[PDB]
Structure formats: structure tokens, C-alpha cells
Amino acid sequence: IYIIGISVSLWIGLTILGLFLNKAVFFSLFVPSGTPLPLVPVLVLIELLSYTARAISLGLRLAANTLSGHLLMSILGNLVKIFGLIPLAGIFAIVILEFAIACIQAYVFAILTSSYLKDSIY
Amino acid sequence: KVSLVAPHQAIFTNKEVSQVNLPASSGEMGVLANHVPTVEELAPGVVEVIESSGTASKYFVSGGFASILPGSKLSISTVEAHPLDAFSSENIKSLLAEAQKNASSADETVAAEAAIEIEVLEALQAAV
Amino acid sequence: SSWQKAGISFNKYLAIAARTVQRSLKNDLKVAAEKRYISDAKVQKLEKVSTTDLASN
Amino acid sequence: MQLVLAAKYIGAAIATIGLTGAGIGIAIVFAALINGTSRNPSLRNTLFPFAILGFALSEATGLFCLMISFLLL
Amino acid sequence: MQLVLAAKYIGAAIATIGLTGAGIGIAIVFAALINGTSRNPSLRNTLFPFAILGFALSEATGLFCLMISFLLL
Amino acid sequence: MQLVLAAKYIGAAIATIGLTGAGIGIAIVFAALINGTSRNPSLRNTLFPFAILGFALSEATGLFCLMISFLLLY
Amino acid sequence: QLVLAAKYIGAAIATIGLTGAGIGIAIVFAALINGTSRNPSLRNTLFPFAILGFALSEATGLFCLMISFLLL
Amino acid sequence: MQLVLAAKYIGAAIATIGLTGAGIGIAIVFAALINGTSRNPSLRNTLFPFAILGFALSEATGLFCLMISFLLLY
Amino acid sequence: LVLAAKYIGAAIATIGLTGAGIGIAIVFAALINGTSRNPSLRNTLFPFAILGFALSEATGLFCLMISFLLLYG
Amino acid sequence: MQLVLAAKYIGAAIATIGLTGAGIGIAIVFAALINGTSRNPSLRNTLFPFAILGFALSEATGLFCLMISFLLL
Amino acid sequence: QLVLAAKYIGAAIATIGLTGAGIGIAIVFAALINGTSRNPSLRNTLFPFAILGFALSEATGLFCLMISFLL
Amino acid sequence: MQLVLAAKYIGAAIATIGLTGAGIGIAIVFAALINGTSRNPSLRNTLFPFAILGFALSEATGLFCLMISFLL
Amino acid sequence: MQLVLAAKYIGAAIATIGLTGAGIGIAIVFAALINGTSRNPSLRNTLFPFAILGFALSEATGLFCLMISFLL
């Protein structure tokens, strides 16, 4: 699941960069705020470079959720050796936060794609 | 230079003052010589104005809006401004006891008006 | 207080604080002061020259 | 295995440096909720639901960083 | 051999230093949302969509930094 | 022993670096409660219950980090 | 031996820059959530500066991650 | 015991670096109490009682961290 | 051995990214909060944000060239 | 005796890292007292007792940390 | 070989001071952007203090960079 | 000795890390005094006496830490 | 002496970590002075003497820490 998540996220990042480059062949380009200054081409850490960082951050949700569930093996040996009822409440809160993180990660990926489509048509 | 004019009489009127301490909405602010521009709301506290030496006149204001102009002018516009010696201790206890019993006892604006009257009566009775 | 949630503005909040401070002071110093907190005025909203019900609180 | 045994004890100590962000996050969310409730009248629900859900998200960093130091012991 | 195995335990300890920014970032967005909701009337939607989307962007630094320490252990 | 014994003493000192977040957390919750109580009149309960419950959550990070340094020295 | 053992240390201390990139996304979101409730910067206006400001603040984390990934 | 003596002396120095949270915690509670007392009119008790009780909770992190560095050098 | 110390120069030099990452958000927070007060929209505050961000990002570009030069020359 | 002499010099320098909390603590109490005195009117006594007693409590961390580095030198 | 190994690590530990120079350039610009919207500190006046204040904060980053570059 | 000379050079650098608290302490008292004097009217007195006495207390941490690095 | 030459480069790099307090200290006094000069009152006096004298006191930490790294 970890290797399939990084491979699926890399294909979505290449499609976002290819769609923005195809629209620049008939609607100018620029994409730079000018305010009586220069050195705007050196800070090209967005658009093309931003797709690589957004794909690794969105694809890491599958690996982070598996790390929380795999951490119960270290707490299972100590609870079967204070009362052990504190581990049940902590595992229930981490499972609810991991399931709710999938909806927040899906909304963050759709919000990032809306900025690329709106800037390519302006 | 103060302009503490009420809606029935004038206290400061002419510019012949030095320092004045009036309770605003945030804290107990105090105007000095060339005060900065600050138009904050005045709460129900004591508005004392020090006249040069120790000739301060404590005026219990009912609340208003302390306006500070940029030319070292303070306009304290309040509804009622009376001294601390014009209040009675026996009559102040009758208004505070009736407002506490009427609070949270009905509906509409009867219970909301009793909470504001109990807070203003407790602050004036503690400054005697 | 929380006067922004109701229908009390700055004019109604200043009149309620001035009337409560005058009644809680000296009873003998109430000369020419009870008329400033009591009025017999009425308000009636008109429409088109007809009007609705007259209210006076 | 002498070098790997000494590195396991030192790895569990430097990994606990993330508790400063998780410990201060529980107080930053409680400071805005205590000062905001006195403005009338965010008490029942409204701001009470965001304080419980916001504290669980800030505490996830302390629980995730503690599993690394516990697995290396 | 022996030097490469000892560096794997220390590589997962210093890499977890980024939890301070991700842990405090989840509480910084919740503190402004709880105090701003009582100012009328950013409750339903409007500010609710930016708080959910803003929390996932601030928590992305902790998930990316955790993959480095997990790959070296 | 030798290398493992020297790493146990140094592990109890580096694990105590997390006390800065737990120590400053008790003052951050107390500063907002003291400044917010002057607005009248959050005294009994209300603000007192959130300050007592909020201080226990911030102190959980320091108590959990202290058990790691104490287990390596004993 | 010495070059292989130093590769693990080259990716551990290099990830310390995530504190600036992680807290930067929350600093721009705190001012945007508190400013939108003042009426009425919703569509565009303030939304364009928050979307463009979040990508510039996240550029530090992408450059620091490429250094740790190249040595590991 | 040459390796255990060098690790014990270095443990008292790294554990003392956590005094920044305890030192700044006593000043954070004092800054809110000094600025809040001038806002009228909680002077005796009320706000002064939370400053005395809040300072003891922030000082618990510095006293607990000092026992770890003192145990390694004695 | 010079190859062992060359890898450490590219990791400890990245500690300066905290000032460049937080500086881009500090200038954006003041520009977003000031534009909602009416009416610093066209130029004025928008033109100073582009020039102000280049000064804060100059520290991160100079620090990144030091660690990149040790890994190649 | 080379191990005890080398560790004594490094212990006195690492113990001086706690001066940042004690140095900034005296300035934090002085910044709130300078801003509050100009807002009228607690100047002589009254609020002067909390500022004098607050500076001595914050200075206890710097004096206690200085005795550790002085005893190992 | 010990002298050449310490020179490479000296260029990385000396770059830790960039956090104060990077955040200092943005702290002076944040107060100038928020104060210019209060009307009317635009031409000169506040422009001279922002240009002179940014050069004083940038002096710490230029002096610290010459130490690591001299190795 | 080689071990005694190496610890003296490392001790002068670790003890100099405390300059961040002493440098920011003199600026914290100066920022409140500059903003407090504009709100009227403590300029040559009142706030002027607390600023001179408050700066001497914050500077005591930098002077004590400098003697440790200078003696090592 | 390989141990004495290796400690000289480490003592000159870790001692420069105190520049964060000196760099941010010059900006803290300039941020409070720029926001106060736009409202009550001028900038050629009053706050002009406090900003020049306050910046020199905060810059003493950077000059004193630079002499330690330059002498090692």
C-alpha cells in the first residue's frame, strides 16, 4: 500500500504539470507579479516544482495512517505485563483522527488543483 | 485643556486643566498634557480631573465616550456627571438589592436590564 | 454587556445607564430630574395617508 | 552490535524534542477558547466543538513522535 | 557495516525535529477559528472550508518528515 | 555496558528538552485566564473549569516525556 | 565506510527546516480566517493572496526535502 | 568506570538547558497580572490568587528537571 | 577522510530555512489583514508584498548555495 | 585525568544555554510594566510590588543554572 | 585530515544565524505594510525608516556569512 | 595537551549561544518604551527611569555568560 | 596538532549562532517605531533618540560574539 500510494501520486503530479504547459501554447504565459523589480525567474519553485511537493505530501497520508496502527504492538506488550484501560481510549482517538484525515487530504488536493486551473486561464 | 460637557450642564467648558483620569472601556486611562488621539467608550466609573496640585474633583460619570483630539484636547461627553459626595449610602443599597432579586426572574428585557444595573451599583459603592 | 444581540443600540444603552444612576443617588436631590426619564410621546408608522396601531411602550 | 546498542538509547532521547510543539499546542488552543468565551456567549456548542476537535489534532504530533522513541528501546 | 547500522538509529531521531512546526501549526489555525467564530458570523461554511483545508496543509510537513525517519529505521 | 552504560546517562539529559513546551504551557493558559477574568465576571466555574482541564492536557506532555528519561536511568 | 555512514546523518539534520514550512501554512491561514469574518473578502480578493502566499511559504520545504532525498 | 564518569558530568549540562521554559514561565504570568491590575479593579485576591497558584505550576517543570541533573552528579 | 564531513555540511546548513519559511508568512499575514480594512487592493500593499518577499527570501537562497557547493565542489 | 578535565570544560558551556530564559524574563516583566505605567496611574507602590517580586522569581532560574556550571570548573 | 574535515562542517554551523536575518527583514516589512493603510504614510516619511531599518537588520547576516565563506 | 586545548575552543562557542536572549532583551524593553512614550506623556521621567534600570538587569545575563567563554 | 586545528573551525562556527538575537533585535525596535510614528506624532525627535540609542545597545551582542569566533 505504501509503494502503490507513491506511484499513484506521481502520476497525478505529472498530469497537472502537463495540462498547464499545454494551455500556455495559446494563451501567453507570464505568470509573474511585476512591481518595478526583477529576478522573478530565479524563484521558479512553484507550478512545476510545486507539483512534486504536493504529490509527496498528499501521498504520505496512506503511510502515516499505517504508522499509527502499527504502533499498537509496542503498547500491547506493556499492557499485558497503572490500569491498562488508558490504551483503549487513546487508540480510539487516533483511529478517528486517521479516518478524518482522509477527508481533509482529499479537500486539500482539490483546492490545490483549483489554483492551477484558474491561473492558467487568466 | 478639557471639554467635559454634559447634556444639561458644562463642567470643564473652557480649557483650564492639566491631568484627568477617566475610566474607559478597556482600562482606567488618564490624559496628561499633549495626549494622543484616542476615541474610546467610557464605562460607569469615576472621572477625576487633577487641577494642577491636589485640587482634583471626583465626578462619578455614568458612561459616555472619551474623545481625545490631536490638538491636546479631551472631550469627555457623558450623560450624567455627579460628585462622590452627592450620593447616599442608604439609598444605594436599596437599588442594588432590588436589581439582584429581579435578575433571572422573568423574561423579555427585564432580566437583561437587571444585570447591567447591578454591575454599575457595585462599582460606585466600593469607591467611597 | 451583550447588547448587540438584542434591539438595544447606543441610544438605548446610554439612557438606561443614566436613569439607573440618578435613581440610586440621593432621594432629596431629585429636584428637576424625574422629568428627564419620563415621557408621554407616542410613535405611529404610516403607510401610503393611513397608519397602523399607535405604540408608546 | 556495540555501536547499534549505544545508538538505540541516544535515538529515543533526541526524538522526544517534538514535545515542545505538542505541549504548547494544547495551551494555545485553550488560551483562545478561554479569552473568547468571555465575549458573550460562545459557551454551549459553537466554540466548544472546535476546542475538542482542535486539541486532538495538535496532540497527534506528540503521540506520533512517541512511537519512534518507544520502538527504538 | 557497523558504522552504517549505528547511523540508522540516529537518523530517525534528528529527523523528528520538524514535529514542533506541525504540532503547533494545527493549534494556530484552530485558535484563530475559535476566536473568530464568536465575532459574528463566520460559522457555517465560509470560514469552515478554509479551516479544514488550512489544517491539512500545515499538517503535511509532519507527514512528509515522518517518512524520512521511518525509511531509515 | 561500556557503550550501553554511557548512552543511558546521556539519554536521560537529552529527553528533558521537552520541558520547555510543558513549562511555558502552564503560563500561557494562566495569562489568558488572568487577563480574561478582569472583564467581569468569569470566576466560579466557566473559565475556571477550562483552565483546570486545559492545564492537565498541557502537563501530559511533560509527564510522558519524564517516564522515558526515568526508564533509561533505572 | 565513512561515506556510507554519513549518508544517514545528511538526511536527519536536513529535515529541521520543516518547522518553518509547517508553521508558515498556519500563519497565513490564521490571518485569512480572522480577516474573512470582518465582511466581505470571500471570493478572490483575499483568497488570491492566501493561495499565492501558501505556495511561496511552502517553497522552503520542497528545497530542503530535495537535499535530504539526494543523500538517502 | 572512566566512561560512566564522563557521561555523568555531561548529563548535568544538557539537563540544565531546559531552564528557558521555567524562567520565561514566571515572567509570562507576571506580565499578564501587571497589565491586568491597571485595568480596574481586581487588586486584592481574585486575580492575585491565580498568580500565586499559577507560578507554582510553571515552576514544577524546573524543579523536576533539576532533580535529574542532580542525581547524575551525586 | 574528507567525504564523511562533506555530507554533514549539507544537513546542518538547512537549519536556516525556518527564518525564510516563516518570513514569507509574516509578510503575507500583514498584507491580508491590512487589505480588509479598505482599500489597499490595486498596487500600494500589493506592490510592496512582491518587493518585500524578495528581501526575506534572500537569506534562504544564500544559505542554500553554501550547502549545495559542498556536495559538488 | 584527561577525561575529567575535558568533560568539565564542555559542561560549563552547555549549562550556560539557560541564560536565554532568564535574560528574556527580566525584559518581559519590564515591557509590561513600562506600557502599563503610561496608561495611568499605578506608579508608586501598588503595581510596583508585583514587578519587583516578579523579576526575582524569573531570576531564580539563571542563578540556579549558574551554580551547576560553577561547581564543575 | 582533521583540519580539512572541520572546514567543511564550519560552513554549515555558521549558517544557523540566517533565521534572525530572514525573519528580521519580514518583521520590519509587516509593520510598514500595516501602518501604511492608516493614511497616509506613502512617499518618504515611513519609506526612509523602512529602508534604513532593513539595512541595519541585514548587517548581521552579511557579517555571519563572511565567516563561513573564509574557510 | 591535545584534549585540554580542544575543549577550550568548543567551550567558547557553546557559551556564546546565550547572546540571543541578551540581544532580544534589550530590544524588548526598547520596543515598549518607544510605543509607550507616544501615548503621552512619560518621556524624560517615569518611563525613562524604568528603561535604564530594566536594561541593566537584562544585560547581566550577557556579561556573566561572556566571562565563562573568555576564561575557557 | 590535528586536534587543535579541528577545534578552531568548530569554535568559530558554533559561536555565530547568536546572530538570531542581534538580527531580530534591530527589527523589533524598528517595527514598533514605524507603527508609532504614523500616529502621534513626528519622527525627527522623541522616538528618534530612542530608536538610535536602542539599536546600538542591541547590536552590542553581535559585535562581542564576533570577536570570539575571529580569535579562535
The amino acid present at M38, given as its one-letter code, is S
Locus of grid cell 496512506: A62
Question: Looking at residue B3, what DSSP letter applies?
Answer: -
Core vs surface per residue M28-38: b (16+ CB within 10 A) or e: bbbbbbbbbbb
I to H contact (≥3 Cβ pairs closer than 8 Å): no
Question: Taking CA G37 as the corner, what is the angle to CA G31 and CA G40, rounded to the nearest 5 degrees?
Answer: 105
After which residues do gaps appear in chain I, with C to N over 2.5 Å? none
**Three-state DSSP class for residue K45:** coil
Alpha-carbon distance of K53 to K57, in angstroms, equals 7
Give A74's contacts in chain E (Cβ within 8 Å).
none
Task: Give the side-chain half-sphere CA count within 13 A for C55.
Answer: 4
Question: Looking at residue B35, what DSSP letter applies?
Answer: P
Q: Does F66 touch chain D (CB under 8 A)?
A: no
Question: Taking CA B41 as the corner, what is the angle to CA B37 and CA B46, rounded to the nearest 5 degrees?
Answer: 105
Chain D / chain E CB contacts < 8 angstroms: 142
Distance, C-alpha A89 to centroid of its chain: 28
> How many beta carbons lie within 10 A of that of residue C45, not counting itself?
9
**Three-state DSSP class for residue M60:** helix
Q: Cα–Cα distances in Å, from D3 out to A2, D15, F72, I2, I58?
A: 30, 18, 17, 22, 41
Alpha-carbon distance of A56 to A54, in angstroms, equals 6
Task: Give L9: exposed, middle or buried? Use CB within 10 Å, 0-12, 13-18, 19+.
Answer: buried
Q: Report chain A's terminal Cα–Cα distance, integer Å.
A: 39
Give me the sign of the Cα torsion angle E4, E5, E8, E10.
negative
Which of E58, E64, E67, E71 to substitute to test the interface with G, most G CBs within 10 Å? E58
Alpha-carbon distance of A113 to I73, in angstroms, equals 39
Q: Cα–Cα distances in Å, from E15 out to C26, E9, E61?
A: 74, 11, 12
**Three-state DSSP class for residue B1:** coil
- At residue B49, φ and ψ (nearest 5 deg) are -125, 110
**Three-state DSSP class for residue I69:** helix
Q: Does E73 touch chain A (CB under 8 A)?
A: no
Helices then strands, each counted (H, E), chain M: 4, 0
A to G contact (≥3 Cβ pairs closer than 8 Å): yes
Alpha-carbon distance of B68 to B55, in angstroms, equals 23
Contact D67 A71 (CB under 8 A): yes
The amino acid present at M17, given as its one-letter code, is I
> Residue F46: left if φ>0, alpha if ψ -120 to 50, beta else—which one?
left
Q: Cα–Cα distances in Å, from A19 out to A3, A54, A113, A118?
A: 25, 16, 11, 12
Whether the Cβ atoms of residue D66 and residue A94 lie closer than 8 Å to each other: no
Contact K31 M34 (CB under 8 A): yes
**Three-state DSSP class for residue H1:** coil
**Three-state DSSP class for residue M11:** helix
> How many beta carbons lie within 10 A of that of residue I12, not counting itself?
25
Give B32's contacts in chain J (Cβ within 8 Å).
40
Which of M3, M17, M34 to substitute to test the interface with K, most K CBs within 10 Å? M34
What residues 1-57 of chain C have any CB closer than 8 A to a CB of chain D? 1-2, 5
Core vs surface per residue K29-66: b (16+ CB within 10 A) or e: bbbbbbbbbeeebeeebbeebbeebbebbbbbbebbbe
Nearest CB to M10: which of L10, L39, L59? L10
* Helix (H), strand (E), coil (C) string for E5-71: HHHHHHHHHHHHHHHHHHHHHHHHHHHHHHHHHCCCCCCCCCHHHHHHHHHHHHCHHHHHHHHHHHH
Mention every residue, 6+ apart, whose C-beta is less than 8 A from residue B24.
B40, B41, B42, B43, B66
Nearest CB to D71: which of A74, A93, A97? A74
Q: Give the closest residue to E35 by CA, choosing from H46, M3, G34.
A: G34
Q: What are the helix (H) ranges across chain B?
A: 89-102, 110-125
* Minimal-distance CA residue of chain M relative to K58: M23
Alpha-carbon distance of K18 to I62, in angstroms, equals 9
Q: How many residues does chain D have?
A: 73
Contact F28 D31 (CB under 8 A): yes
Grid coordinates of A78: 506493556
Alpha-carbon distance of M70 to I15, in angstroms, equals 22
Whether the Cβ atoms of residue A35 and residue I50 lie closer than 8 Å to each other: yes
Distance, C-alpha I66 to centroid of its chain: 15
E-assigned strands of D1-73? none
Q: Does I61 touch chain K (CB under 8 A)?
A: no
Give B38's contacts in chain L (Cβ within 8 Å).
39
Q: Does B38 touch chain H (CB under 8 A)?
A: no
Whether the Cβ atoms of residue B1 and residue B30 lie closer than 8 Å to each other: no
Contact H6 J11 (CB under 8 A): no
Alpha-carbon distance of A9 to A12, in angstroms, equals 5
H helix or E strand, kind and range, residue H63: helix H47-72
User: Does I39 sit behind a cis peptide bond, omega within 30 degrees of 0 on the bond before it?
Assistant: yes
Alpha-carbon distance of H47 to H36, in angstroms, equals 8
C47: β partners:
C50
> Residue B14: left if φ>0, alpha if ψ -120 to 50, beta else—which one?
beta
Question: What is the strand order of the sheet B73-78 is part of?
Answer: B40-42, B64-69, B73-78
**Three-state DSSP class for residue B78:** strand
Mention every residue, 6+ apart, whose C-beta is less than 8 A from residue H47.
F34, F37, F38, H33, H36, H37
Method used to obtain the model: cryo-EM
Annotated resolution, angstroms: 7.0
- At residue J20, φ and ψ (nearest 5 deg) are -70, -35
Alpha-carbon distance of A88 to F28, in angstroms, equals 30
Whether the Cβ atoms of residue B28 and residue B123 lie closer than 8 Å to each other: no
Alpha-carbon distance of L56 to J30, in angstroms, equals 11
Q: Does K12 touch chain I (CB under 8 A)?
A: yes
Q: What share of chain I is helix, strand, coil (3-state, %, to 5)?
A: 75, 0, 25
Nearest CB to F62: which of D9, D23, D73? D23
Q: Chain G closest CA to E26's CA: distance in Å?
A: 7
Alpha-carbon distance of H47 to E69, in angstroms, equals 46
Question: Looking at residue C27, what DSSP letter applies?
Answer: S
B69: β partners:
B73
DSSP conformation letters of L8-68: HHHHHHHGGGGHHHHHHHHHHHHHHHHHHHTTSS-SSSTHHHHHHHHHHHHTHHHHHHHHH
I60: β partners:
none
Whether the Cβ atoms of residue G42 and residue I43 lie closer than 8 Å to each other: no
Alpha-carbon distance of D16 to F63, in angstroms, equals 12
Alpha-carbon distance of J21 to J19, in angstroms, equals 5
Task: Give the side-chain half-sphere CA count within 13 A for H40.
Answer: 21
Whether the Cβ atoms of residue H10 and residue J11 lie closer than 8 Å to each other: yes
Q: Does I71 touch chain G (CB under 8 A)?
A: yes
**Three-state DSSP class for residue G42:** coil
H helix or E strand, kind and range, residue B83: strand B81-83
* Minimal-distance CA residue of chain D relative to F30: D31
Q: Report chain K's terminal Cα–Cα distance, integer Å.
A: 15
Q: Chain A closest CA to I47's CA: distance in Å?
A: 5
Mention every residue, 6+ apart, whose C-beta is less than 8 A from residue A120.
A19, A20, A23, A24, A27
Core vs surface per residue A14-35: b (16+ CB within 10 A) or e: eebbeebeebeeeeeeeeeeee
Alpha-carbon distance of L15 to L71, in angstroms, equals 11
Alpha-carbon distance of B44 to E14, in angstroms, equals 57
Alpha-carbon distance of B118 to B93, in angstroms, equals 11
Question: Taking CA B9 as the corner, what is the angle to CA B7 and CA B14, rounded to the nearest 5 degrees?
Answer: 110
Give me the sign of the Cα torsion angle F53, F55, F58, F59.
negative
The amino acid present at G35, given as its one-letter code, is G
Q: Does M44 touch chain B (CB under 8 A)?
A: no
B47: β partners:
B59
E to H contact (≥3 Cβ pairs closer than 8 Å): no
> How many beta carbons lie within 10 A of that of residue G40, not counting itself?
11
Which of I15, I48, I63 to substitute to test the interface with K, most K CBs within 10 Å? I63
Given a contact as 3+ CB pairs under 8 Å, which chains touch D? A, C, E, F
Q: Report chain F's terminal Cα–Cα distance, integer Å.
A: 14
> Residue B106: left if φ>0, alpha if ψ -120 to 50, beta else—which one?
beta
Task: Give H20: exposed, middle or buried? Use CB within 10 Å, 0-12, 13-18, 19+.
Answer: buried
Which residue pairs, CB below 8 angstroms and at least 24 apart, start in B105-111?
Answer: B109/C6, B109/C8
Q: Give the closest residue to A109 by CA, choosing from B109, K12, L53, E53.
A: E53
Contact G1 E6 (CB under 8 A): no
Alpha-carbon distance of F9 to L61, in angstroms, equals 29
The amino acid present at K7, given as its one-letter code, is K
Helix F47-72 and helix F3-14, axial crossing angle in degrees, nearest 10: 170
Q: Cα–Cα distances in Å, from E38 out to E34, G34, I35, M62?
A: 7, 11, 22, 45
Whether the Cβ atoms of residue L65 and residue L18 lie closer than 8 Å to each other: yes
Helix D60-71 and helix A61-70, axial crossing angle in degrees, nearest 10: 60
Alpha-carbon distance of K22 to K41, in angstroms, equals 25
Q: Does G55 touch chain A (CB under 8 A)?
A: yes
* Minimal-distance CA residue of chain H relative to J66: H16
Give J41's contacts in chain B (Cβ within 8 Å).
21, 28, 30
- At residue K43, φ and ψ (nearest 5 deg) are -75, 125
Give A94's contacts in chain D (Cβ within 8 Å).
60, 63
Distance, C-alpha C29 to centroid of its chain: 22
B76: β partners:
B66
Grid coordinates of L60: 547581566
Pairing of strands B73-78, B46-50: unpaired
Locus of grid cell 538509547: D9
Alpha-carbon distance of J32 to J39, in angstroms, equals 11
Q: Does H26 touch chain J (CB under 8 A)?
A: yes
Chain A / chain E CB contacts < 8 angstroms: 39
Nearest CB to E56: which of A56, A67, A105? A105
Q: Does G50 touch chain I (CB under 8 A)?
A: yes
Q: Does D67 touch chain A (CB under 8 A)?
A: yes
Alpha-carbon distance of B110 to E67, in angstroms, equals 62
Given a contact as 3+ CB pairs under 8 Å, which chains touch K? I, M
Whether the Cβ atoms of residue K36 and residue I37 lie closer than 8 Å to each other: no
Alpha-carbon distance of H25 to M16, in angstroms, equals 27
- At residue B24, φ and ψ (nearest 5 deg) are -95, -165
Helix M60-70 and helix L2-14, axial crossing angle in degrees, nearest 10: 160
Which of E9, E33, E43, E57 to substitute to test the interface with G, most G CBs within 10 Å? E57
